Design a protein around this ligand. Sequence first.
Ligand code: AMP
Ligand code: AMP
Ligand code: AMP
Ligand code: AMP
Ligand code: F6P
Ligand code: F6P
Ligand code: F6P
Ligand code: F6P
Ligand code: MN
Ligand code: MN
Ligand code: MN
Ligand code: MN
Ligand code: MN
Ligand code: MN
Ligand code: MN
Ligand code: MN
Lengths: 326, 326, 326, 326
Amino acid sequence: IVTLTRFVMEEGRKARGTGEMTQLLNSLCTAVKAISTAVRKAGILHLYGIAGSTNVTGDQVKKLDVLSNDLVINVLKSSFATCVLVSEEDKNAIIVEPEKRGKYVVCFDPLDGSSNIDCLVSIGTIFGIYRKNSTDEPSEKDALQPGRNLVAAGYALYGSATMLVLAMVNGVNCFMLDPAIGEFILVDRDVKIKKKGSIYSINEGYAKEFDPAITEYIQRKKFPPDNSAPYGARYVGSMVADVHRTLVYGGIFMYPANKKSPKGKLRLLYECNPMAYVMEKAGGLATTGKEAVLDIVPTDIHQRAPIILGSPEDVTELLEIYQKHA
Amino acid sequence: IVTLTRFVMEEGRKARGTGEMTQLLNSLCTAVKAISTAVRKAGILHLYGIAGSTNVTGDQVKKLDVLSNDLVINVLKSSFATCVLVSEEDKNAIIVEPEKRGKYVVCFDPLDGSSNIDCLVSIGTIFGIYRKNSTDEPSEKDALQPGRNLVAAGYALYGSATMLVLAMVNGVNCFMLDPAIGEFILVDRDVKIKKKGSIYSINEGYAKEFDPAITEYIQRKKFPPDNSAPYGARYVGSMVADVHRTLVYGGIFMYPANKKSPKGKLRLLYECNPMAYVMEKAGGLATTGKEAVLDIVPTDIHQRAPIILGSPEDVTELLEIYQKHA
Amino acid sequence: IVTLTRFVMEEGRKARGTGEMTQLLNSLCTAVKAISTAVRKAGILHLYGIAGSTNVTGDQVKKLDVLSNDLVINVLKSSFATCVLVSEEDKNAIIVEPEKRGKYVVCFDPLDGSSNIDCLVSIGTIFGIYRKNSTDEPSEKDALQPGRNLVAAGYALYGSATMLVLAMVNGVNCFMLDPAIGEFILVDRDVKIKKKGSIYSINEGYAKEFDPAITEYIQRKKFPPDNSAPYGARYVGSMVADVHRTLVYGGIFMYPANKKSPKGKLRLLYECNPMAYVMEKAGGLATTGKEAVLDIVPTDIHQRAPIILGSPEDVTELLEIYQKHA
Amino acid sequence: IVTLTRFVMEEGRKARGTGEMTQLLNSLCTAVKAISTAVRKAGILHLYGIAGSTNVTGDQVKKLDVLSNDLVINVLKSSFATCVLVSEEDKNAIIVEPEKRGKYVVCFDPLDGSSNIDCLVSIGTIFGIYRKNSTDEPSEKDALQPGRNLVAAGYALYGSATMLVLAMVNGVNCFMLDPAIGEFILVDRDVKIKKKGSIYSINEGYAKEFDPAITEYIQRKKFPPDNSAPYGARYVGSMVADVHRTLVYGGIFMYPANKKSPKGKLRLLYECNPMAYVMEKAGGLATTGKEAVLDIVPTDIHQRAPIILGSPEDVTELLEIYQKHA
Ligand SMILES: Nc1ncnc2c1ncn2[C@@H]1O[C@H](COP(=O)(O)O)[C@@H](O)[C@H]1O
Ligand SMILES: Nc1ncnc2c1ncn2[C@@H]1O[C@H](COP(=O)(O)O)[C@@H](O)[C@H]1O
Ligand SMILES: Nc1ncnc2c1ncn2[C@@H]1O[C@H](COP(=O)(O)O)[C@@H](O)[C@H]1O
Ligand SMILES: Nc1ncnc2c1ncn2[C@@H]1O[C@H](COP(=O)(O)O)[C@@H](O)[C@H]1O
Ligand SMILES: O=P(O)(O)OC[C@H]1O[C@](O)(CO)[C@@H](O)[C@@H]1O
Ligand SMILES: O=P(O)(O)OC[C@H]1O[C@](O)(CO)[C@@H](O)[C@@H]1O
Ligand SMILES: O=P(O)(O)OC[C@H]1O[C@](O)(CO)[C@@H](O)[C@@H]1O
Ligand SMILES: O=P(O)(O)OC[C@H]1O[C@](O)(CO)[C@@H](O)[C@@H]1O
Ligand SMILES: [Mn+2]
Ligand SMILES: [Mn+2]
Ligand SMILES: [Mn+2]
Ligand SMILES: [Mn+2]
Ligand SMILES: [Mn+2]
Ligand SMILES: [Mn+2]
Ligand SMILES: [Mn+2]
Ligand SMILES: [Mn+2]
């Protein structure tokens, strides 16, 4: 029945758009379809391996990182829709050339889940979009806006299937990719997260580095005090996968500050904020433990932040702990 | 360069086979390719949902369970290669009809990872094969052989890519599926597992139900006593995915007996034993905590067992704990 | 490098469009991709057979006719771009409903080449587009415009490859479909036809029904009077295929009036005019034998016309004969 | 229901085979699937163009010629099934190396229809297979057997769909390729040709070079003397396509000797004989005009012959003319 293209246009029409938010999104889709095709046979393309470098953020860069990165930089460019790009792979903001330039700023993780490539676990692409504020010549500053300024945010999951999840002012919609005809077919319209789930998702390899609240919280999931059943544990290793499972099954996902990462691991611009926006749009929350993610005015484009998100009741139960303690 | 077909035949030729081990395997591949195609667009085929029943083992059965099941039952049948089939989905052994019958017994999880379907996490298919012993009319007994009798074992992963991993007397080989031409192209020849890794994989939602060894072991992964770095934690939720990551990255995977499941959760016939065989063939171990999995003469086809597997040094470190305690 | 999407937008941007010519075209592409996927496995979908009816024009209707028809009617509708549709399969004009209506009229052969389906020869889709003139409530009349009013025209070939050929005021571009990622990649930019070729393409099964000019002309192709080599003969059976080969190799294609079809066989609205427009835009001609096709004000939507098209020198050589005789 | 693999094995089983006729055939299929994938996007792979050479037989060699050739040479080799290969592209017989050698001789047109590549018309692959006679070290002679010695013959059509047609002692079966899962699904079981059709297929560009019988025959198709309707004319340009349409619709296909090609154009080994074998197995005929094709002991591997084939009544009507005249 409904293709992403169609849905795009019908929702962008009713909002009276110029078509520019549109070109952009459709450009992004092609990017996703291309990445997804490569991923489904990346080992047959010798795309596992290193490309040979370290990130601005520290990552040991893989070829897939590269390919998928170029693709997005390409497709966003040719869209005539954007003016500033912030990529995980790129040290500095990318300023579109003047003739190809649009009024949009786009932050993205071209391939989230690097630790999961070689072993063929789920991985994905995350992106956010803000409308340009400044009249300034477009600079790196036009990215340093908080999450509450996002006009669109989503991510693609190359899981058992390839899914494109997309949130805007009015809600979250999931579209799945039909490899056969190369289109994204709406699978879930206007998705909402459960008020409470029963899955906690965290790398407990940092049990020792964790703070007193995370510690108390986990213990409560494992030793429920109302003597209810203990939450299930899940941690795929790929932010896009865990966030998504949290989305459809409910529960909570966690990458908290620890004694070593005052500011957690995940990046504000291109992992944290879009995931938060999606999530709030579905009716769940997203906190550092101490403040909403979407309210944080970034000062650095590669800056990290902690992140608690998911079922509102769960996220709340833990905000309470953080209070109980600080 | 090398397709599964080719590799099959060249290795089956050198062993002087009848071609029967062969027909069988190739039949299995088609099964896998079909399952994989459906999975990559299962939501677009309305294959998420329930089919409407409970298993012999307890599972809330999904349509994918069904489809994928029928397919294997079909393809194994038409192969002329098998005589007894044991399926997760099927209460009783399936006895091939006499004209289509072969000298092989095939146990399989048609779709492992049901809790992970809806959220699009990795899932897969696991299978084992034994040569028929009895001259008896083929009965359910011809399945009740221990794991050290396996002639072939492997599984397919529908992860970010679709992989077909296969172990026989001589070693483990990975083949990836190229959707484009619908063939399985050898990606890794004669794979070996690291002697020690740094990932422990377990549902810690049962922290409370766990025994003293598992408990002590996890604590050691989190609080290394040689003050080394603490292992990373991973738990996809899908046996096929976690086993596989263990395979290529090293580390350990765990689904131990607990105060509620004297005998763990996973089934001996079609989850545990094939995974153990693969794993031992790669150079790692697979234990109940108390005995090798492959040495356990099953008495029931749907019987469960605990299972510790992975890097030999890790699996050993924990066997020691189990000793230290019992 | 360039996708149809991209090329669409960049050429529609420079013309200052509303995006409406655009939505429409992209809708058409999805239609084509869908038709093409089905065709590449139509026998495996039991799509060879009859659907069970006769056309307004006389055709024994096949299921593919139907499927492909519905698809276009669907996709053109949802585009918000059109107001009147004329289909080969549909007796009367189709008037889009008011809320979904646009300012465009679209005539199309949903699946050209029915005699060639069962035997797996090339087949295709042809379409034309005019901008609405009347302020009249959109009626069937808004289709009864001549070919020189076309704003866009092309067709898709499902040949050995799937090609999308598209002509507008500024020229003809070919895009090929990459099944892998489901996009149309520009293969030939701004195509031109040779001034003269060496292939004549005609159903000589009507040798007897043919007029004196066609007869004289064919004889000249077979017995060249400058004692040059005789033209090659080609006649696939599928208008889309023969027109296209004429396009890229040069030569001439013919479906002339005969003693039985005062007005030839092919339909003006949806076979003849778009093929003529493409062809003139490439630098060749298209004549009834007596008048340009694009100058013919249709009076009936299912009306036929003769059609000579291809290399300008050839088409001219034959216009001369038609003169020499009448 | 039935895959080529399955059908292969079940028919090869009942004949009590070694599996060697089998390996071979399945190797051939992969070859076909690979060629077909490339063809469906050959322009996107820059595979239109010249590779840069002339054949033993005269052809201006295209890259597709090359790719597809290598593939077959590869796959036939690795099959362990063959000992001599005769290719259109290869001047001399190819003698498999001793360790990879089998008891089979395989002649093939790796890509029939070169004049049709660039314009995206249907093209294909033709092949024949004979069992080795000599005890001689395998030489070029083991190919110089007549057509009545063929054990298997068929061809693949990359038309609107990709079809694999295959004849053996017991009859002709068509299998279509489902791109989706990369398998060949039986579409027509044990096919038969009509006793008479109404389509004559010939390059009438040689009207002038033709002999008195062909001339008289064509005139009869166009001016039926029983005043019946005149046959339809078809000539795709691609032997594989015209032969196939003849197969399923009935009628006749013609590439006769002419004043310039005492021996017609098509090659005996790899175009003519397999097409003849298929055709006779369906219940039609195949003649030079003067003698069955399958009875001709070749003396040269690249030798040509005329060829009339199709509906037995038609082929007969024309054999009579050839008599009437000589
Ligand atoms: N396809 C669309 N879906 C939803 N909103 C849109 C769309 N296109 C445009 N808009 C809204 O209109 C604003 C400007 O549109 P545009 O003129 O295309 O940049 C955006 O910030 C959106 O909020
Ligand atoms: N394709 C193969 N690869 C490895 N071993 C094989 C193969 N086919 C047969 N064998 C060996 O030969 C035994 C019997 O072969 P079969 O006669 O095909 O049942 C099996 O138990 C295998 O150990
Ligand atoms: N994508 C496009 N390519 C070429 N011309 C276009 C395109 N879109 C619009 N136009 C031109 O602008 C006119 C109206 O555009 P629209 O406002 O989209 O209906 C059309 O008749 C075209 O000639
Ligand atoms: N798959 C098959 N289908 C039909 N006949 C076969 C097949 N395999 C073998 N045969 C017959 O058995 C002969 C030798 O088989 P093989 O031992 O495989 O070379 C061939 O010449 C065939 O006529
Ligand atoms: O390896 P860790 O410490 O568990 O962190 C995993 C995280 O790393 C990422 O790959 C980004 O670094 C995320 O996708 C994922 O949540
Ligand atoms: O849901 P739990 O208790 O973590 O168990 C997960 C296990 O269940 C299975 O789906 C089989 O029941 C395995 O794939 C997986 O290891
Ligand atoms: O069957 P005929 O008389 O040769 O006409 C063939 C024509 O018919 C069509 O299928 C439309 O009727 C065209 O595609 C093709 O040119
Ligand atoms: O170009 P001509 O003379 O019509 O001959 C066409 C023949 O050439 C071939 O391409 C082989 O030369 C055949 O496929 C086809 O029948
Ligand atoms: Mn990244
Ligand atoms: Mn990431
Ligand atoms: Mn299962
Ligand atoms: Mn399972
Ligand atoms: Mn039609
Ligand atoms: Mn038509
Ligand atoms: Mn050739
Ligand atoms: Mn040929």
